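Co-fold these.
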Amino acid sequence: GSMGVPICGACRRPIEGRVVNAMGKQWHVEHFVCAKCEKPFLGHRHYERKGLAYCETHYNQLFGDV
Ligand SMILES: [Zn+2]
Ligand SMILES: [Zn+2]
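Predicted complex below.
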C-alpha cells in the first residue's frame, strides 16, 4: 500500500488527472503558471528560470537566455 498520487506544489494537494513535472515537483496542469503573471499553461508551453516558471515573454522579459 505505498503512496501513488502526485501533489501539486501549488496547493500541496494530491493531483489526480494530468500532472506537470516542474521544479522537480508536480503541479496541477491548472495551477502550473508563470512565476511573474500567474498565467496557467493548461495546454500551452511554459518557460523556467532560476527554478521558477515564466511565460514565454516574462521568462524572456526576465532573461531569455541572453
Ligand atoms: Zn494545485
Ligand atoms: Zn508570465
